[PDB]
Amino acid sequence: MMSREADHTIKGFLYQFNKTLNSILSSTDQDEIQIEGIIEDIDIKNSNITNAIQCKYHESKVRHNLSDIYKPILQMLLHFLENDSLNIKYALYAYFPNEQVGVKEVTKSQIEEILSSSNFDYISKYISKIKPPKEQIIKELLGKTSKTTEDKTRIKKYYETSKLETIVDIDKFLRDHFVFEIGLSYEELMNETKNLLMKEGFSLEDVKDLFYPNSIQYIAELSILPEAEKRISSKNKLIDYLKGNKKTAMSRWTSEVLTRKQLLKVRKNQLVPSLNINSRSRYFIIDPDTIDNFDDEFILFVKDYLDKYNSKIKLHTETPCFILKTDVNNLSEYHKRFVSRNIQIITGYIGDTFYFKEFNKEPKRIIKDNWVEFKARISCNSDEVIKCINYKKCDDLYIVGGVDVSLLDTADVNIENLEINNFRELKYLLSMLKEI
Amino acid sequence: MMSREADHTIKGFLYQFNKTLNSILSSTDQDEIQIEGIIEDIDIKNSNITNAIQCKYHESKVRHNLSDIYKPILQMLLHFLENDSLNIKYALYAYFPNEQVGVKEVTKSQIEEILSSSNFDYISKYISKIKPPKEQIIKELLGKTSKTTEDKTRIKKYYETSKLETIVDIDKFLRDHFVFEIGLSYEELMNETKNLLMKEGFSLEDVKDLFYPNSIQYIAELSILPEAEKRISSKNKLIDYLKGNKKTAMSRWTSEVLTRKQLLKVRKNQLVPSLNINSRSRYFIIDPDTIDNFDDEFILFVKDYLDKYNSKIKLHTETPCFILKTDVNNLSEYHKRFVSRNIQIITGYIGDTFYFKEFNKEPKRIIKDNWVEFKARISCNSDEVIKCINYKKCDDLYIVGGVDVSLLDTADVNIENLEINNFRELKYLLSMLKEI
Amino acid sequence: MMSREADHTIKGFLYQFNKTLNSILSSTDQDEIQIEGIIEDIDIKNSNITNAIQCKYHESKVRHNLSDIYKPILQMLLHFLENDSLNIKYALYAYFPNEQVGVKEVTKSQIEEILSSSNFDYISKYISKIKPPKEQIIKELLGKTSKTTEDKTRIKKYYETSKLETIVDIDKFLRDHFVFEIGLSYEELMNETKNLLMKEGFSLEDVKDLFYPNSIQYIAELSILPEAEKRISSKNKLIDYLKGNKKTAMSRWTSEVLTRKQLLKVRKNQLVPSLNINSRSRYFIIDPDTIDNFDDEFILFVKDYLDKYNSKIKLHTETPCFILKTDVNNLSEYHKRFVSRNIQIITGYIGDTFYFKEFNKEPKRIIKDNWVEFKARISCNSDEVIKCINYKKCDDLYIVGGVDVSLLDTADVNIENLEINNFRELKYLLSMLKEI
């Protein structure tokens, strides 16, 4: 059972995908997309927030029924009572197989009869906050983090016939804000999006992986900067980042973009070319937080990587690297472990001072002895590291989940991603572990 | 949607093929050939123009129909009212499978009936210029750069129920100018052209790859120089340029292997017996008009060509040299991507002026270290020196699109000039990357 | 005729040398040393400045005479009345052959008698500003930029018999400010300074090549940072910087007030170690704006620098490179004349983007052909250049005068700085040209 916040974020990214498709189809002056700070109380100190997508989906069988509205409504209602109480216009984009598409209207009753759901989870999670009861016993029970079946029954009894009065103006609370709309099945929509995007030449798979993902990333990052004036978008900019270069375009986060659907196919094996070639120096810019564990396990990965792509000495002449965003001091906390399987692999920081030389050294080799003087190297995703793009420069650029993108050269480097939580699947994706 | 100007140029080259075949079959004193300044507003200020080839072809199912004469007719009609009013008599040679062969006759009634096309696109594009309306609302709508369906219907009813009177002499406007003739299937006529060209010694592959480009470019460039007296042609000249040299003639020509599918048709292979050979200094000539992103997403072509034909130190012994058609000051900037993928090679124009022993020096070599000094060269097409790119041609000018026709000693460097789309479609010919 | 401002700078450097020697002799809690921003109107907006050295020395024959203090006196007098009117107290430490060592005393009568210089040069230069000319017949002529002998005589008569009353408080203008003391002949004092420095181990030539420049530059740069709290000096800091490392000392600056002019002495030939050794990659960080002849002439130096330290190709493995602070574009506008005289180099930038590591790759020498893949390389001082001190990191350095030092790793690299004004003397810093 995954947290509902993850599903909210997933469908928010899906709505972002819809916005990107709309912008691509228009290819002209399009609305200015601004991100919403609702995932956590970041407190960016901004007021021009309109999207605020916190939608949710559940199993659907036929048409729509009254059993298709759930807690998400209550949590967005509480978000309405934001600490800063600024523009918090929310939206709902629930999908139904065969139902009329439109808005649910902002009549008071249509949400009033929905409010009285009469569920203990709903009552004790969010409803209790919007309605401060006069029964201080209930308040103390809620604050004590302890309840019993009789207590739940009594609370439901009070909320059934002894309904309380809230402290928020109901007329302004369910009429002005909030917009309702019927969504679409994204399972049958990703194919349509890919077909629509494949209007120019481009390629077969890079359209899926090289232009749609970079458009997604650009749309997502268009409004992540602290400045509120960075959201300015015009026809000229939207055509510049539609056909300006848009052949490599430095597509940063590509693999599966962001959704996790079991394994990772098709786009996994496309990384072999330029990597099977034994004279290329593929890089790895990852972040351990998106990974699961970093205490000793990573070196194991390193081994199965290093033992492969700097072996067969006569052939392999280029030494890969590793950029992972643990720390600078923590990195050497593995540089000691590195000597465990006849491996040497360079910290890059070598301590606490990134030396840009050994992070792009081409060591020379021995044919007779089956040896290379360091199978690969390691580094961190630091601001003062711009070296994927300057020598044997990652003819394929590989990243995990997220990255400090700015300050890099970003020029003719076949950049792609693989979003992972473990290094076992990293082996499985780099084509050196059969499973997982 | 391919541009109609490109179709006009293709049909002009088809009629060039027709003239070439007629002249070759005659091999004696043949009609005069002169180019037409209709592709752009060049304003050559010459009057001896009769060809004015602006033909176009549309979909055909069986026989011919009145719907086979679209806007191009209107374009020729407007072009008849040239600013300098020179001899601009246009011609149409559209192919028709069945039915009679001959001219459409200059009857006034037929042309009047044809003129009643009544199409929104035609009305808003060229027809509006023919008839200056007394109403100024129509003119404002045309010049407003923003029209609506109601406006289009208003204009259509204005020009249909209240058809205007044009200011041009109708009698001279539908009878004297323009000629029509029934065309032939050019796709099936290429084989006949090659078979007829297979009458001299020549060879098997060279007919399909060597001599037909020679003939087409001879006929096209016979009358390109500014002087109007350089077009003179006699029986002696035609026999000399049919068998006199007609072997290399400093190849600045191809128009085939244009079938855009990975490995397009054939002519990728002709120049291979130069590339495989280890003492061939291949020299190119390129134009950014087709090839794209000469600072952003080119150089991948360079990377592959260079890692193939100057990598194996043992056999190969020569450096390729690129001529492109970008500015002479912006070339050291267009250079970025070279060092942006470790493909070390010189800039050619060296930033402002062209110092070029290094544009024709032998790439020194060492075998033991698998080291190639510089794998290629870029310079640009500017006249500064284009007579050092016709000398060491091993076989080919390997021209891409545009060219600097002059300052090029005219003999003895085999054949290649492929006007091709992008950097990636230059690879298949220069077959280093078997795919795209 | 050498500029007087240059002489003032030389005297300031000499008194910096004297302060450094005093600190070395003490090597304990010693007074604070602060630089004076009086060389130009930098307007640092600082008040705790007392040195304010603008001294000068002239010819001396025996003892001293009333004519031993020239215009510099009046220059200091004007500099006393600064626009901001801050602590600008001046000092004088000129040398005298035979004279009682002591101050000139602040008696008003002596300074008043000195004030009657009666020289047209001084009056037209500085004295005219001291006394506001109430008779504008002189101010207008001064602003006319045109004067004659009659005008000089008129000014002399005006200032001789028609003495004018100044607006500055004379009592405070000749008594409180300015300090005097009898100097010493530094020409013979250099030997004494070197002998005194020869107290610890050190070496013979290094006392005149390595450590003295260390001390001089350390004292000079102690108070160049914008922060005013960095000037604090104590016994612990003095001892730590006096005998902390002092093996290579990261000795940036190298020369002093000596025969350092046109041809350089002091570390002119001793740099050969690691420079003859065929396994070093000496770098160059310089600035051309101080230099004069840089449009194409610099390539000449490149030539003969690139025909020695990357010639004799059997042994020379590593490569040089140039960090010259010209510009990004000017380098392109200086790119031109590179492949002109049988030398190839890498731009380092390759356009409008500095490149990190192509600026460092290995041009693998050739045994049977006498060639290297770039006899050397160029780059400008891209603030995004921390690269001397990472790759093949310039085990010797040769800077000119002083250039942007921020961001440097300054680790493991024998950083050095030999000032020049053109490249002919730069050679002999690198020691190939027999003279100059």
GROMACS .gro file of N, CA and C in nm, chain A residues 108-158:
model
  153
  108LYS      N    1  -2.398   2.469  -0.338
  108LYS     CA    2  -2.362   2.435  -0.201
  108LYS      C    3  -2.400   2.291  -0.167
  109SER      N    4  -2.521   2.249  -0.203
  109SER     CA    5  -2.569   2.117  -0.163
  109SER      C    6  -2.485   2.006  -0.223
  110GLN      N    7  -2.448   2.020  -0.351
  110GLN     CA    8  -2.380   1.912  -0.421
  110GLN      C    9  -2.253   1.868  -0.350
  111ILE      N   10  -2.192   1.957  -0.271
  111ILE     CA   11  -2.081   1.919  -0.185
  111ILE      C   12  -2.125   1.901  -0.040
  112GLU      N   13  -2.235   1.964   0.002
  112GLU     CA   14  -2.280   1.953   0.140
  112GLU      C   15  -2.321   1.810   0.173
  113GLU      N   16  -2.405   1.749   0.089
  113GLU     CA   17  -2.442   1.610   0.116
  113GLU      C   18  -2.324   1.515   0.100
  114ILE      N   19  -2.222   1.554   0.022
  114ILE     CA   20  -2.102   1.472   0.013
  114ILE      C   21  -2.020   1.482   0.141
  115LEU      N   22  -2.023   1.598   0.208
  115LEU     CA   23  -1.941   1.617   0.328
  115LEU      C   24  -1.975   1.514   0.435
  116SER      N   25  -2.103   1.484   0.454
  116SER     CA   26  -2.147   1.391   0.558
  116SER      C   27  -2.121   1.246   0.516
  117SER      N   28  -1.993   1.214   0.499
  117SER     CA   29  -1.955   1.079   0.459
  117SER      C   30  -1.975   0.980   0.573
  118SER      N   31  -1.953   1.025   0.697
  118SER     CA   32  -1.972   0.941   0.815
  118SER      C   33  -1.878   0.820   0.813
  119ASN      N   34  -1.748   0.850   0.810
  119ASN     CA   35  -1.643   0.749   0.818
  119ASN      C   36  -1.543   0.789   0.925
  120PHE      N   37  -1.501   0.692   1.007
  120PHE     CA   38  -1.409   0.723   1.115
  120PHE      C   39  -1.276   0.776   1.063
  121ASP      N   40  -1.223   0.715   0.957
  121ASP     CA   41  -1.098   0.765   0.900
  121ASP      C   42  -1.112   0.911   0.860
  122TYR      N   43  -1.218   0.943   0.785
  122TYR     CA   44  -1.240   1.080   0.742
  122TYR      C   45  -1.263   1.172   0.861
  123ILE      N   46  -1.341   1.126   0.959
  123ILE     CA   47  -1.376   1.211   1.073
  123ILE      C   48  -1.251   1.246   1.153
  124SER      N   49  -1.167   1.147   1.181
  124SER     CA   50  -1.054   1.166   1.271
  124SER      C   51  -0.929   1.218   1.200
  125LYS      N   52  -0.922   1.209   1.068
  125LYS     CA   53  -0.803   1.258   0.998
  125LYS      C   54  -0.809   1.408   0.973
  126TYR      N   55  -0.915   1.456   0.909
  126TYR     CA   56  -0.920   1.595   0.866
  126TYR      C   57  -1.046   1.668   0.910
  127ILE      N   58  -1.161   1.600   0.915
  127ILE     CA   59  -1.286   1.668   0.946
  127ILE      C   60  -1.281   1.731   1.084
  128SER      N   61  -1.216   1.663   1.180
  128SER     CA   62  -1.211   1.715   1.316
  128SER      C   63  -1.146   1.852   1.322
  129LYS      N   64  -1.051   1.880   1.232
  129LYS     CA   65  -0.981   2.008   1.237
  129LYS      C   66  -1.068   2.122   1.186
  130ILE      N   67  -1.143   2.099   1.078
  130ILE     CA   68  -1.227   2.205   1.023
  130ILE      C   69  -1.342   2.237   1.118
  131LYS      N   70  -1.388   2.139   1.195
  131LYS     CA   71  -1.498   2.159   1.290
  131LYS      C   72  -1.445   2.141   1.432
  132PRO      N   73  -1.411   2.248   1.503
  132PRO     CA   74  -1.365   2.233   1.642
  132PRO      C   75  -1.482   2.203   1.733
  133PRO      N   76  -1.487   2.083   1.792
  133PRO     CA   77  -1.603   2.046   1.872
  133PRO      C   78  -1.607   2.116   2.007
  134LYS      N   79  -1.728   2.132   2.059
  134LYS     CA   80  -1.747   2.179   2.196
  134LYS      C   81  -1.724   2.069   2.298
  135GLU      N   82  -1.712   1.944   2.254
  135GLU     CA   83  -1.683   1.831   2.342
  135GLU      C   84  -1.531   1.821   2.356
  136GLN      N   85  -1.478   1.888   2.459
  136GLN     CA   86  -1.334   1.885   2.482
  136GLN      C   87  -1.284   1.744   2.509
  137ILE      N   88  -1.373   1.652   2.549
  137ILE     CA   89  -1.332   1.513   2.567
  137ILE      C   90  -1.286   1.454   2.435
  138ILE      N   91  -1.359   1.482   2.327
  138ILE     CA   92  -1.319   1.433   2.195
  138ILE      C   93  -1.185   1.493   2.155
  139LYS      N   94  -1.166   1.622   2.182
  139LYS     CA   95  -1.039   1.686   2.149
  139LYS      C   96  -0.923   1.621   2.223
  140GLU      N   97  -0.942   1.594   2.353
  140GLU     CA   98  -0.835   1.532   2.431
  140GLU      C   99  -0.810   1.388   2.386
  141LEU      N  100  -0.916   1.316   2.349
  141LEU     CA  101  -0.899   1.182   2.295
  141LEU      C  102  -0.818   1.185   2.166
  142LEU      N  103  -0.849   1.280   2.077
  142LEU     CA  104  -0.773   1.292   1.953
  142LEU      C  105  -0.628   1.327   1.980
  143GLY      N  106  -0.604   1.418   2.075
  143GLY     CA  107  -0.468   1.457   2.109
  143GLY      C  108  -0.391   1.353   2.187
  144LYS      N  109  -0.459   1.252   2.242
  144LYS     CA  110  -0.393   1.147   2.318
  144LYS      C  111  -0.344   1.032   2.231
  145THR      N  112  -0.376   1.033   2.102
  145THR     CA  113  -0.336   0.926   2.010
  145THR      C  114  -0.382   0.789   2.060
  146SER      N  115  -0.507   0.783   2.105
  146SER     CA  116  -0.564   0.658   2.155
  146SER      C  117  -0.715   0.662   2.139
  147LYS      N  118  -0.772   0.555   2.084
  147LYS     CA  119  -0.915   0.547   2.063
  147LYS      C  120  -0.958   0.401   2.065
  148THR      N  121  -1.088   0.379   2.085
  148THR     CA  122  -1.146   0.245   2.091
  148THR      C  123  -1.273   0.241   2.007
  149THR      N  124  -1.324   0.120   1.987
  149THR     CA  125  -1.442   0.102   1.902
  149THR      C  126  -1.561   0.179   1.958
  150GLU      N  127  -1.582   0.173   2.089
  150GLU     CA  128  -1.691   0.248   2.150
  150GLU      C  129  -1.673   0.398   2.127
  151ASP      N  130  -1.549   0.447   2.135
  151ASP     CA  131  -1.524   0.588   2.110
  151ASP      C  132  -1.560   0.625   1.966
  152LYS      N  133  -1.523   0.540   1.870
  152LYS     CA  134  -1.558   0.568   1.731
  152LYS      C  135  -1.709   0.570   1.712
  153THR      N  136  -1.779   0.474   1.773
  153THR     CA  137  -1.924   0.470   1.760
  153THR      C  138  -1.987   0.595   1.821
  154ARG      N  139  -1.939   0.638   1.937
  154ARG     CA  140  -1.993   0.758   2.000
  154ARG      C  141  -1.966   0.881   1.915
  155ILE      N  142  -1.846   0.893   1.859
  155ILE     CA  143  -1.814   1.009   1.775
  155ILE      C  144  -1.904   1.010   1.652
  156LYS      N  145  -1.925   0.893   1.591
  156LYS     CA  146  -2.014   0.886   1.476
  156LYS      C  147  -2.157   0.923   1.515
  157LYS      N  148  -2.200   0.882   1.635
  157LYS     CA  149  -2.332   0.920   1.682
  157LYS      C  150  -2.344   1.071   1.697
  158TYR      N  151  -2.242   1.135   1.755
  158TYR     CA  152  -2.245   1.281   1.768
  158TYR      C  153  -2.247   1.348   1.631
   0.00000   0.00000   0.00000
